[PDB]
Amino acid sequence: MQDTIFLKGMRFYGYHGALSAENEIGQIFKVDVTLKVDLSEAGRTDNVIDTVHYGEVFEEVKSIMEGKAVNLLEHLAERIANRINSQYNRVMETKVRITKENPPIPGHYDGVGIEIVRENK
Amino acid sequence: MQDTIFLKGMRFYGYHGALSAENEIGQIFKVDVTLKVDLSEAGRTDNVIDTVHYGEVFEEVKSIMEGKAVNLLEHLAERIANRINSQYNRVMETKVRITKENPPIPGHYDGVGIEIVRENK
Amino acid sequence: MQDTIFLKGMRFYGYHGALSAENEIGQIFKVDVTLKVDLSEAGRTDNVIDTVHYGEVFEEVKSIMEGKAVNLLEHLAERIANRINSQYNRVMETKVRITKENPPIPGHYDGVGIEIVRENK
Amino acid sequence: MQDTIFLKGMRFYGYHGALSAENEIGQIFKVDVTLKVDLSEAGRTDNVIDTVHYGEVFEEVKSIMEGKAVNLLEHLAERIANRINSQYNRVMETKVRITKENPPIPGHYDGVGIEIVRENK
Amino acid sequence: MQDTIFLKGMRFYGYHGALSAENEIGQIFKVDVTLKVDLSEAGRTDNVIDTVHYGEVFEEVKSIMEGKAVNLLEHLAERIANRINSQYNRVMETKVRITKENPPIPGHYDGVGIEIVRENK
Amino acid sequence: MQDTIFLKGMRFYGYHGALSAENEIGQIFKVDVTLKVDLSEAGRTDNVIDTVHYGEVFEEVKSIMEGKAVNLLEHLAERIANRINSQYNRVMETKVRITKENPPIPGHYDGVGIEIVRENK
Amino acid sequence: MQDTIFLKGMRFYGYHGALSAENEIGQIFKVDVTLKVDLSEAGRTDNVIDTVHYGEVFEEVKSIMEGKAVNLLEHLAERIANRINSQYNRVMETKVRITKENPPIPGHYDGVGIEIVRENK
Amino acid sequence: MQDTIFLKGMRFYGYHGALSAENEIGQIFKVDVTLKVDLSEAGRTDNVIDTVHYGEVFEEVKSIMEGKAVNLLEHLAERIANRINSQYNRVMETKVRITKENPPIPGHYDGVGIEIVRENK
Ligand SMILES: Nc1nc(O)c2nn(-c3cccc(C(=O)NCc4ccccc4Sc4ccccc4CO)c3)nc2n1
Ligand SMILES: Nc1nc(O)c2nn(-c3cccc(C(=O)NCc4ccccc4Sc4ccccc4CO)c3)nc2n1
Ligand SMILES: Nc1nc(O)c2nn(-c3cccc(C(=O)NCc4ccccc4Sc4ccccc4CO)c3)nc2n1
Ligand SMILES: Nc1nc(O)c2nn(-c3cccc(C(=O)NCc4ccccc4Sc4ccccc4CO)c3)nc2n1
Ligand SMILES: Nc1nc(O)c2nn(-c3cccc(C(=O)NCc4ccccc4Sc4ccccc4CO)c3)nc2n1
Ligand SMILES: Nc1nc(O)c2nn(-c3cccc(C(=O)NCc4ccccc4Sc4ccccc4CO)c3)nc2n1
Ligand SMILES: Nc1nc(O)c2nn(-c3cccc(C(=O)NCc4ccccc4Sc4ccccc4CO)c3)nc2n1
Ligand SMILES: Nc1nc(O)c2nn(-c3cccc(C(=O)NCc4ccccc4Sc4ccccc4CO)c3)nc2n1
């Protein structure tokens, strides 16, 4: 089963980071969420109730990304995957990628970040 | 067998969406289609009749994307995969990705969408 | 005097537009603001009090772009130029460009919009 | 008076070109239109009737770009400027830029084209 | 063994295509080549003779892409994979992707093309 | 008279540069040419003989950019402007911009270069 | 005289900013420098000694951008323009644009900054 | 286990290359590093000590990329993978991609390079 529902390049201004100054100034966090969902019923029915609402997922990601500042991207993604898996039984597995395009790293790069994959139990 | 025929970033202005206002205003839909096709005969012969015509595939996608408005991206992709699989026996499997880069979601992101993979029976 | 202070590609999700459906769904508005300001004193002093604060300007633009929905981009830009000119005497003239990259126009384009230039009286 | 109304990166697939093969195959034409229009009344009133409708302008450009094939970009732009100037008295001057990003020129470049500026008489 | 040597976005102006007009006018062909090669010896030695020369590979691709016009992308890629596999025993497998970003297809898309994977016998 | 004919982002691999190593290795040179030409006759007539051929201009630029290596970008642009002005009486003035996106400068930048404007005598 | 020598998109990681946290964490500063220089002698001679060395200019910009942290972009640009004007008599005027693409401003934008133009006395 | 920590598009100006002239002039090297690391503990704890520090990894890559010039990209990547695997036991495997976007290859392409994957022993 290779069907997926995705939300790409979601950007949020947040205050996460292990560094005091980061928590103070903040920065933009980029988030990609890919959900493993069987979409054949919805493909047949065309009834919005047979699939997972992208809009609702964005709201969940947003509430976590624009909420309380935490130290790690690992913790933010764990909370997002866990939030999506908990509320949608149709999601067989959740992939969350978070990128800091402008972290406190003296250099020239496109971004740094993490990616996790959590199956829905 | 890892050979594929692809059509990337096809853009169509359509009226699909579960929201009345979407159906009224419309938006641009981005579509990626990847077809699993054994291309060694055509690679040998160079005869256009031994492969699947990209132009014809685009026409099929277009007729569906610019046709009657439906609620879901899931339904649009199901119709496209089913249309391609039905008319081309050489296509072993069809992957259809549809992205709404500008859906009615208050936020900053690159796009939202779905992706399905349907083997040709 | 060719010195300027600028804010490029500011993006806001708003509900402006002459069409009911636009007001309902909303869309992203892109805004460029260029201010004619003599920057030699600040270039000499390095004292933030001798120039116009980009951060404060962004806040002004934001309050207007994310506020009450109006029909025209012309009206939004007039309000922004007027807001900036009114609060900063050092701004000799304000240029405001607003782009709707995804208006209700069935077609393929990069964007549509307006640009105004208002001298500070 | 530096106010303008603009339409950027409009893309149309057409068959214009002095070469037979071009007329046969076609290509994408990119068009930028900038109109000199005094926008202060509309900025005051917020009444759509006090400005020039971007949507209507796009329709005009489209009808010319997707219509009968001609030899020159110069002729296409002359027809567009003339069409806009004729129907809108508020347009003091029309600038039309047309780019062939992929003309029959053996080489590597971003595009070739012309730009004209026609005052409204 | 997941090591690879790659050449991305190689662009050549050629005259390939099943349509007479294409052969006459030509267009830009984009080519991506990925070679499966064990790079640990070279990683140890740092001796250029223990790996496959990217420059030589580009020359091979070029000679085929800028040579005699053929009908299919399938045939061009088959010739490239076969050319690389034949001359380099260290290449365990060759992947060739060819994209026509501007084919004679009336529409808006990013590109169309094929991709093949050929193991070296 | 604000009409212009332009060729943007022409790229050529050349060996120009004041440094021996540059002459040996080479690099990509990016060239923009803007010609001041009255395009109203051609806009009226649609006859290719009433304007300046973009294709011919590209050929001229190419012959200079891919020819004998010289030390300066200033000299290359002077030769191009002079070549275009000499062969086309309809060109009232020629602007030539040449960019070295990857010169032997240890740093991070988008490009360095020169731009000249030469009226046709 | 419209000839210019330019350096575009120079990027430096620095610690400038009126905010303590900025000075602590730092960020990338983007700089564009355009110099008004008569390039006809060099265009004639092809002798590097008749023009201004882009490499030397970059070094000057770099020494200022990667040096002591100051509060304002206005001060940094004033120092750069003044440094270039002082060391090169052939530079009739220096334009310096500095952009903070990621300042401590909670929002979505492309960048904020200033631009100054200083004639060489 | 599909969790990863990544650093994308790191750019360094170095002098690596098998050609004398390359070693003399230098060029920009682009590096992507993907680390296979189990991130669930850190996702639970939010304690920076339970994961691998992206900043420290960048420093390692940098020290190798901006250090002594070597002939091959294969050798540079082998040293990086080996450096990361050696210092971090939590890294189960290291993927290093190095791209020369502007090598001494007369042509038009996006880049050439290699990619290696080394499990941590
Ligand atoms: N795995 C992970 N996940 C997160 O969410 C993290 N947040 N930080 C984090 C915490 C504290 C500092 C930094 C940071 O980027 N520091 C950059 C830096 C780190 C280590 C060593 C050097 C540097 S930069 C440097 C080095 C030498 C001189 C001057 C500088 C610039 O400050 C990041 N690391 C994370 N790792
Ligand atoms: N899986 C899927 N597939 C499709 O094809 C869909 N079309 N829509 C769809 C239908 C109705 C509404 C929307 C939509 O994007 N609504 C966005 C939204 C949804 C849910 C909750 C909030 C919001 S936005 C919001 C929230 C609070 C205040 C103000 C707003 C902006 O309207 C999308 N959802 C789909 N899901
Ligand atoms: N100068 C200006 N400023 C603003 O802020 C505006 N907002 N709108 C606005 C208001 C109402 C409708 C639209 C709009 O874009 N409509 C697009 C459209 C307009 C006119 C004619 C045709 C079309 S699209 C079309 C045409 C034929 C068939 C189907 C369609 C798609 O609806 C925009 N126009 C503005 N002009
Ligand atoms: N000012 C202007 N405006 C237009 O609208 C034009 N359409 N064409 C046009 C007409 C006929 C041919 C071409 C074209 O691009 N030909 C390219 C070309 C022209 C002249 C000389 C050489 C070439 S390409 C070439 C050269 C040598 C060998 C092989 C080739 C590839 O065919 C363009 N020129 C225009 N000029
Ligand atoms: N698998 C494959 N590989 C190649 O290398 C190919 N080259 N062509 C090829 C050959 C002949 C024509 C075309 C082409 O793109 N034609 C586009 C087109 C094809 C089929 C049906 C319609 C169209 S476009 C169209 C349709 C209706 C009206 C007007 C038009 C524009 O001409 C491409 N097809 C290939 N397929
Ligand atoms: N106006 C102009 N026009 C041209 O066409 C030029 N070609 N070169 C040119 C000639 C010789 C060297 C270079 C070059 O870019 N050198 C870069 C450099 C120049 C001056 C000072 C330092 C550097 S880089 C540097 C500095 C210190 C240590 C290590 C390095 C890297 O080599 C360029 N300069 C031009 N100027
Ligand atoms: N003209 C100019 N030049 C420079 O070089 C400047 N550096 N700063 C500067 C100094 C201090 C703070 C900031 C900054 O961007 N602050 C952003 C901000 C400023 C003013 C008001 C609000 C904000 S953001 C905000 C607002 C409300 C709640 C939360 C936040 C996020 O901190 C920038 N301003 C400059 N102006
Ligand atoms: N696998 C690998 N890894 C590295 O790190 C390499 N560095 N070089 C390397 C060494 C020496 C030369 C070049 C180079 O790119 N040369 C380009 C070139 C190579 C072979 C054949 C032709 C050419 S370009 C050419 C051809 C004909 C005429 C004129 C030219 C331009 O010089 C690269 N090759 C590598 N391969």
mmCIF file with all atom_site columns, N, CA and C in Angstrom, chain D residues 16 31 33 57 59-88 94-96 98 114 116 118, chain F residues 39-46:
data_model
loop_
_atom_site.group_PDB
_atom_site.id
_atom_site.type_symbol
_atom_site.label_atom_id
_atom_site.label_alt_id
_atom_site.label_comp_id
_atom_site.label_asym_id
_atom_site.label_entity_id
_atom_site.label_seq_id
_atom_site.pdbx_PDB_ins_code
_atom_site.Cartn_x
_atom_site.Cartn_y
_atom_site.Cartn_z
_atom_site.occupancy
_atom_site.B_iso_or_equiv
_atom_site.pdbx_formal_charge
_atom_site.auth_seq_id
_atom_site.auth_comp_id
_atom_site.auth_asym_id
_atom_site.auth_atom_id
_atom_site.pdbx_PDB_model_num
ATOM 1   N N  . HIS D 1 16  ? 2.764   31.523 -32.797 1.00 0.00 ? 16  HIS D N  1
ATOM 2   C CA . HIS D 1 16  ? 3.440   32.638 -33.445 1.00 0.00 ? 16  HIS D CA 1
ATOM 3   C C  . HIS D 1 16  ? 4.918   32.345 -33.728 1.00 0.00 ? 16  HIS D C  1
ATOM 4   N N  . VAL D 1 31  ? 4.221   36.732 -20.966 1.00 0.00 ? 31  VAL D N  1
ATOM 5   C CA . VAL D 1 31  ? 3.846   38.138 -21.132 1.00 0.00 ? 31  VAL D CA 1
ATOM 6   C C  . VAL D 1 31  ? 3.697   38.925 -19.833 1.00 0.00 ? 31  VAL D C  1
ATOM 7   N N  . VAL D 1 33  ? 2.560   42.744 -18.472 1.00 0.00 ? 33  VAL D N  1
ATOM 8   C CA . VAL D 1 33  ? 1.871   43.965 -18.866 1.00 0.00 ? 33  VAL D CA 1
ATOM 9   C C  . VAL D 1 33  ? 1.860   44.912 -17.679 1.00 0.00 ? 33  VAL D C  1
ATOM 10  N N  . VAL D 1 57  ? -8.148  42.687 -18.163 1.00 0.00 ? 57  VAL D N  1
ATOM 11  C CA . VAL D 1 57  ? -6.952  42.891 -18.944 1.00 0.00 ? 57  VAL D CA 1
ATOM 12  C C  . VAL D 1 57  ? -6.358  41.561 -19.373 1.00 0.00 ? 57  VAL D C  1
ATOM 13  N N  . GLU D 1 59  ? -7.896  38.822 -19.860 1.00 0.00 ? 59  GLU D N  1
ATOM 14  C CA . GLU D 1 59  ? -8.737  38.263 -20.908 1.00 0.00 ? 59  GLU D CA 1
ATOM 15  C C  . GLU D 1 59  ? -8.344  38.837 -22.267 1.00 0.00 ? 59  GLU D C  1
ATOM 16  N N  . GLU D 1 60  ? -8.029  40.127 -22.294 1.00 0.00 ? 60  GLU D N  1
ATOM 17  C CA . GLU D 1 60  ? -7.647  40.773 -23.540 1.00 0.00 ? 60  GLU D CA 1
ATOM 18  C C  . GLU D 1 60  ? -6.331  40.211 -24.030 1.00 0.00 ? 60  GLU D C  1
ATOM 19  N N  . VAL D 1 61  ? -5.353  40.131 -23.132 1.00 0.00 ? 61  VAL D N  1
ATOM 20  C CA . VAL D 1 61  ? -4.051  39.595 -23.497 1.00 0.00 ? 61  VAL D CA 1
ATOM 21  C C  . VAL D 1 61  ? -4.205  38.182 -24.050 1.00 0.00 ? 61  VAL D C  1
ATOM 22  N N  . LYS D 1 62  ? -4.971  37.369 -23.330 1.00 0.00 ? 62  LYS D N  1
ATOM 23  C CA . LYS D 1 62  ? -5.235  35.981 -23.700 1.00 0.00 ? 62  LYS D CA 1
ATOM 24  C C  . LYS D 1 62  ? -5.841  35.812 -25.077 1.00 0.00 ? 62  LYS D C  1
ATOM 25  N N  . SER D 1 63  ? -6.861  36.607 -25.380 1.00 0.00 ? 63  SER D N  1
ATOM 26  C CA . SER D 1 63  ? -7.525  36.535 -26.675 1.00 0.00 ? 63  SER D CA 1
ATOM 27  C C  . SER D 1 63  ? -6.565  36.804 -27.826 1.00 0.00 ? 63  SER D C  1
ATOM 28  N N  . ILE D 1 64  ? -5.555  37.631 -27.572 1.00 0.00 ? 64  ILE D N  1
ATOM 29  C CA . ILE D 1 64  ? -4.575  37.967 -28.594 1.00 0.00 ? 64  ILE D CA 1
ATOM 30  C C  . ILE D 1 64  ? -3.462  36.922 -28.668 1.00 0.00 ? 64  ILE D C  1
ATOM 31  N N  . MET D 1 65  ? -2.986  36.487 -27.502 1.00 0.00 ? 65  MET D N  1
ATOM 32  C CA . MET D 1 65  ? -1.913  35.497 -27.419 1.00 0.00 ? 65  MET D CA 1
ATOM 33  C C  . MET D 1 65  ? -2.324  34.084 -27.853 1.00 0.00 ? 65  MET D C  1
ATOM 34  N N  . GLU D 1 66  ? -3.575  33.722 -27.600 1.00 0.00 ? 66  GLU D N  1
ATOM 35  C CA . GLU D 1 66  ? -4.079  32.405 -27.973 1.00 0.00 ? 66  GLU D CA 1
ATOM 36  C C  . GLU D 1 66  ? -4.908  32.427 -29.259 1.00 0.00 ? 66  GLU D C  1
ATOM 37  N N  . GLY D 1 67  ? -4.851  33.549 -29.969 1.00 0.00 ? 67  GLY D N  1
ATOM 38  C CA . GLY D 1 67  ? -5.587  33.686 -31.211 1.00 0.00 ? 67  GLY D CA 1
ATOM 39  C C  . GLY D 1 67  ? -4.697  33.393 -32.403 1.00 0.00 ? 67  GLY D C  1
ATOM 40  N N  . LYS D 1 68  ? -5.088  33.920 -33.558 1.00 0.00 ? 68  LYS D N  1
ATOM 41  C CA . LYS D 1 68  ? -4.362  33.744 -34.812 1.00 0.00 ? 68  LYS D CA 1
ATOM 42  C C  . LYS D 1 68  ? -2.853  33.939 -34.684 1.00 0.00 ? 68  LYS D C  1
ATOM 43  N N  . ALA D 1 69  ? -2.098  33.014 -35.263 1.00 0.00 ? 69  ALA D N  1
ATOM 44  C CA . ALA D 1 69  ? -0.653  33.083 -35.214 1.00 0.00 ? 69  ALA D CA 1
ATOM 45  C C  . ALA D 1 69  ? -0.136  34.177 -36.134 1.00 0.00 ? 69  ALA D C  1
ATOM 46  N N  . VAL D 1 70  ? 0.820   34.952 -35.637 1.00 0.00 ? 70  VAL D N  1
ATOM 47  C CA . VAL D 1 70  ? 1.431   36.014 -36.414 1.00 0.00 ? 70  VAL D CA 1
ATOM 48  C C  . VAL D 1 70  ? 2.921   35.731 -36.423 1.00 0.00 ? 70  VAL D C  1
ATOM 49  N N  . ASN D 1 71  ? 3.671   36.499 -37.193 1.00 0.00 ? 71  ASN D N  1
ATOM 50  C CA . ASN D 1 71  ? 5.098   36.272 -37.271 1.00 0.00 ? 71  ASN D CA 1
ATOM 51  C C  . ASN D 1 71  ? 5.869   36.828 -36.097 1.00 0.00 ? 71  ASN D C  1
ATOM 52  N N  . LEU D 1 72  ? 5.602   38.083 -35.762 1.00 0.00 ? 72  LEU D N  1
ATOM 53  C CA . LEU D 1 72  ? 6.351   38.765 -34.717 1.00 0.00 ? 72  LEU D CA 1
ATOM 54  C C  . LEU D 1 72  ? 5.784   39.023 -33.336 1.00 0.00 ? 72  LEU D C  1
ATOM 55  N N  . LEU D 1 73  ? 6.695   39.049 -32.378 1.00 0.00 ? 73  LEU D N  1
ATOM 56  C CA . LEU D 1 73  ? 6.350   39.347 -31.003 1.00 0.00 ? 73  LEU D CA 1
ATOM 57  C C  . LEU D 1 73  ? 5.993   40.825 -30.981 1.00 0.00 ? 73  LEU D C  1
ATOM 58  N N  . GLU D 1 74  ? 6.627   41.589 -31.878 1.00 0.00 ? 74  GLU D N  1
ATOM 59  C CA . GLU D 1 74  ? 6.416   43.041 -32.003 1.00 0.00 ? 74  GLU D CA 1
ATOM 60  C C  . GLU D 1 74  ? 4.962   43.341 -32.358 1.00 0.00 ? 74  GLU D C  1
ATOM 61  N N  . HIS D 1 75  ? 4.404   42.515 -33.240 1.00 0.00 ? 75  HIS D N  1
ATOM 62  C CA . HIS D 1 75  ? 3.028   42.671 -33.691 1.00 0.00 ? 75  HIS D CA 1
ATOM 63  C C  . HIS D 1 75  ? 2.034   42.255 -32.625 1.00 0.00 ? 75  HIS D C  1
ATOM 64  N N  . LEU D 1 76  ? 2.379   41.221 -31.873 1.00 0.00 ? 76  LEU D N  1
ATOM 65  C CA . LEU D 1 76  ? 1.511   40.746 -30.812 1.00 0.00 ? 76  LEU D CA 1
ATOM 66  C C  . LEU D 1 76  ? 1.412   41.783 -29.708 1.00 0.00 ? 76  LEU D C  1
ATOM 67  N N  . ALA D 1 77  ? 2.548   42.350 -29.327 1.00 0.00 ? 77  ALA D N  1
ATOM 68  C CA . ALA D 1 77  ? 2.592   43.361 -28.279 1.00 0.00 ? 77  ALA D CA 1
ATOM 69  C C  . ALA D 1 77  ? 1.927   44.678 -28.699 1.00 0.00 ? 77  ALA D C  1
ATOM 70  N N  . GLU D 1 78  ? 2.029   45.008 -29.982 1.00 0.00 ? 78  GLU D N  1
ATOM 71  C CA . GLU D 1 78  ? 1.434   46.218 -30.536 1.00 0.00 ? 78  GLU D CA 1
ATOM 72  C C  . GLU D 1 78  ? -0.095  46.087 -30.458 1.00 0.00 ? 78  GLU D C  1
ATOM 73  N N  . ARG D 1 79  ? -0.587  44.884 -30.738 1.00 0.00 ? 79  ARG D N  1
ATOM 74  C CA . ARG D 1 79  ? -2.018  44.603 -30.706 1.00 0.00 ? 79  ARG D CA 1
ATOM 75  C C  . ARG D 1 79  ? -2.549  44.626 -29.274 1.00 0.00 ? 79  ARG D C  1
ATOM 76  N N  . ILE D 1 80  ? -1.742  44.143 -28.333 1.00 0.00 ? 80  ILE D N  1
ATOM 77  C CA . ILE D 1 80  ? -2.142  44.118 -26.930 1.00 0.00 ? 80  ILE D CA 1
ATOM 78  C C  . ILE D 1 80  ? -2.181  45.524 -26.348 1.00 0.00 ? 80  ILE D C  1
ATOM 79  N N  . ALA D 1 81  ? -1.119  46.297 -26.580 1.00 0.00 ? 81  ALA D N  1
ATOM 80  C CA . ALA D 1 81  ? -1.040  47.657 -26.066 1.00 0.00 ? 81  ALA D CA 1
ATOM 81  C C  . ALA D 1 81  ? -2.189  48.469 -26.635 1.00 0.00 ? 81  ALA D C  1
ATOM 82  N N  . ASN D 1 82  ? -2.411  48.307 -27.934 1.00 0.00 ? 82  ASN D N  1
ATOM 83  C CA . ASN D 1 82  ? -3.468  49.007 -28.641 1.00 0.00 ? 82  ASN D CA 1
ATOM 84  C C  . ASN D 1 82  ? -4.850  48.594 -28.148 1.00 0.00 ? 82  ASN D C  1
ATOM 85  N N  . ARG D 1 83  ? -5.014  47.323 -27.793 1.00 0.00 ? 83  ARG D N  1
ATOM 86  C CA . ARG D 1 83  ? -6.296  46.831 -27.286 1.00 0.00 ? 83  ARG D CA 1
ATOM 87  C C  . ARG D 1 83  ? -6.585  47.412 -25.895 1.00 0.00 ? 83  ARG D C  1
ATOM 88  N N  . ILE D 1 84  ? -5.570  47.439 -25.036 1.00 0.00 ? 84  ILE D N  1
ATOM 89  C CA . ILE D 1 84  ? -5.734  47.958 -23.683 1.00 0.00 ? 84  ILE D CA 1
ATOM 90  C C  . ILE D 1 84  ? -5.934  49.473 -23.672 1.00 0.00 ? 84  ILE D C  1
ATOM 91  N N  . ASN D 1 85  ? -5.162  50.180 -24.485 1.00 0.00 ? 85  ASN D N  1
ATOM 92  C CA . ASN D 1 85  ? -5.254  51.625 -24.550 1.00 0.00 ? 85  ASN D CA 1
ATOM 93  C C  . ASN D 1 85  ? -6.608  52.068 -25.074 1.00 0.00 ? 85  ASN D C  1
ATOM 94  N N  . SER D 1 86  ? -7.123  51.332 -26.053 1.00 0.00 ? 86  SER D N  1
ATOM 95  C CA . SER D 1 86  ? -8.414  51.634 -26.664 1.00 0.00 ? 86  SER D CA 1
ATOM 96  C C  . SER D 1 86  ? -9.619  51.476 -25.736 1.00 0.00 ? 86  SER D C  1
ATOM 97  N N  . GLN D 1 87  ? -9.613  50.424 -24.923 1.00 0.00 ? 87  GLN D N  1
ATOM 98  C CA . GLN D 1 87  ? -10.738 50.147 -24.040 1.00 0.00 ? 87  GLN D CA 1
ATOM 99  C C  . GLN D 1 87  ? -10.714 50.776 -22.657 1.00 0.00 ? 87  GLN D C  1
ATOM 100 N N  . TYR D 1 88  ? -9.565  51.281 -22.228 1.00 0.00 ? 88  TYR D N  1
ATOM 101 C CA . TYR D 1 88  ? -9.468  51.904 -20.910 1.00 0.00 ? 88  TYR D CA 1
ATOM 102 C C  . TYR D 1 88  ? -8.840  53.294 -20.976 1.00 0.00 ? 88  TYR D C  1
ATOM 103 N N  . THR D 1 94  ? 0.654   51.965 -21.736 1.00 0.00 ? 94  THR D N  1
ATOM 104 C CA . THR D 1 94  ? 0.750   50.497 -21.607 1.00 0.00 ? 94  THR D CA 1
ATOM 105 C C  . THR D 1 94  ? 2.124   49.930 -22.018 1.00 0.00 ? 94  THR D C  1
ATOM 106 N N  . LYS D 1 95  ? 2.723   49.145 -21.123 1.00 0.00 ? 95  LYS D N  1
ATOM 107 C CA . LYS D 1 95  ? 4.010   48.513 -21.388 1.00 0.00 ? 95  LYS D CA 1
ATOM 108 C C  . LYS D 1 95  ? 3.753   47.011 -21.573 1.00 0.00 ? 95  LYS D C  1
ATOM 109 N N  . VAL D 1 96  ? 4.212   46.454 -22.681 1.00 0.00 ? 96  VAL D N  1
ATOM 110 C CA . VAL D 1 96  ? 4.012   45.037 -22.943 1.00 0.00 ? 96  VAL D CA 1
ATOM 111 C C  . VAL D 1 96  ? 5.340   44.376 -23.228 1.00 0.00 ? 96  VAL D C  1
ATOM 112 N N  . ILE D 1 98  ? 7.089   40.630 -24.038 1.00 0.00 ? 98  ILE D N  1
ATOM 113 C CA . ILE D 1 98  ? 6.784   39.270 -24.439 1.00 0.00 ? 98  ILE D CA 1
ATOM 114 C C  . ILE D 1 98  ? 8.098   38.526 -24.561 1.00 0.00 ? 98  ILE D C  1
ATOM 115 N N  . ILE D 1 114 ? 10.893  40.977 -26.665 1.00 0.00 ? 114 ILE D N  1
ATOM 116 C CA . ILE D 1 114 ? 10.817  42.414 -26.896 1.00 0.00 ? 114 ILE D CA 1
ATOM 117 C C  . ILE D 1 114 ? 9.959   43.070 -25.841 1.00 0.00 ? 114 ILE D C  1
ATOM 118 N N  . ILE D 1 116 ? 7.700   46.860 -25.428 1.00 0.00 ? 116 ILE D N  1
ATOM 119 C CA . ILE D 1 116 ? 7.286   48.123 -26.012 1.00 0.00 ? 116 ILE D CA 1
ATOM 120 C C  . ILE D 1 116 ? 6.512   48.935 -24.992 1.00 0.00 ? 116 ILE D C  1
ATOM 121 N N  . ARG D 1 118 ? 3.633   52.073 -25.033 1.00 0.00 ? 118 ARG D N  1
ATOM 122 C CA . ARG D 1 118 ? 2.754   52.884 -25.866 1.00 0.00 ? 118 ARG D CA 1
ATOM 123 C C  . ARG D 1 118 ? 1.842   53.768 -25.036 1.00 0.00 ? 118 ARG D C  1
ATOM 124 N N  . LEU F 1 39  ? 10.255  49.710 -32.316 1.00 0.00 ? 39  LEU F N  1
ATOM 125 C CA . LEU F 1 39  ? 9.506   48.560 -32.813 1.00 0.00 ? 39  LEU F CA 1
ATOM 126 C C  . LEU F 1 39  ? 8.109   48.823 -33.341 1.00 0.00 ? 39  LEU F C  1
ATOM 127 N N  . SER F 1 40  ? 7.752   50.083 -33.546 1.00 0.00 ? 40  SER F N  1
ATOM 128 C CA . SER F 1 40  ? 6.410   50.386 -34.036 1.00 0.00 ? 40  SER F CA 1
ATOM 129 C C  . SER F 1 40  ? 6.179   50.019 -35.504 1.00 0.00 ? 40  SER F C  1
ATOM 130 N N  . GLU F 1 41  ? 7.204   50.107 -36.348 1.00 0.00 ? 41  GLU F N  1
ATOM 131 C CA . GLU F 1 41  ? 6.985   49.746 -37.743 1.00 0.00 ? 41  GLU F CA 1
ATOM 132 C C  . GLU F 1 41  ? 6.647   48.259 -37.785 1.00 0.00 ? 41  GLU F C  1
ATOM 133 N N  . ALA F 1 42  ? 7.502   47.445 -37.161 1.00 0.00 ? 42  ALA F N  1
ATOM 134 C CA . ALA F 1 42  ? 7.307   45.992 -37.098 1.00 0.00 ? 42  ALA F CA 1
ATOM 135 C C  . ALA F 1 42  ? 5.987   45.649 -36.402 1.00 0.00 ? 42  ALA F C  1
ATOM 136 N N  . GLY F 1 43  ? 5.626   46.418 -35.386 1.00 0.00 ? 43  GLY F N  1
ATOM 137 C CA . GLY F 1 43  ? 4.362   46.186 -34.719 1.00 0.00 ? 43  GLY F CA 1
ATOM 138 C C  . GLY F 1 43  ? 3.196   46.418 -35.672 1.00 0.00 ? 43  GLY F C  1
ATOM 139 N N  . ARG F 1 44  ? 3.392   47.309 -36.646 1.00 0.00 ? 44  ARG F N  1
ATOM 140 C CA . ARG F 1 44  ? 2.365   47.623 -37.635 1.00 0.00 ? 44  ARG F CA 1
ATOM 141 C C  . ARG F 1 44  ? 2.371   46.561 -38.730 1.00 0.00 ? 44  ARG F C  1
ATOM 142 N N  . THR F 1 45  ? 3.531   46.396 -39.351 1.00 0.00 ? 45  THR F N  1
ATOM 143 C CA . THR F 1 45  ? 3.697   45.471 -40.465 1.00 0.00 ? 45  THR F CA 1
ATOM 144 C C  . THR F 1 45  ? 3.711   43.969 -40.213 1.00 0.00 ? 45  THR F C  1
ATOM 145 N N  . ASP F 1 46  ? 4.319   43.553 -39.105 1.00 0.00 ? 46  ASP F N  1
ATOM 146 C CA . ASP F 1 46  ? 4.434   42.138 -38.753 1.00 0.00 ? 46  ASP F CA 1
ATOM 147 C C  . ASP F 1 46  ? 5.425   41.470 -39.703 1.00 0.00 ? 46  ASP F C  1
#
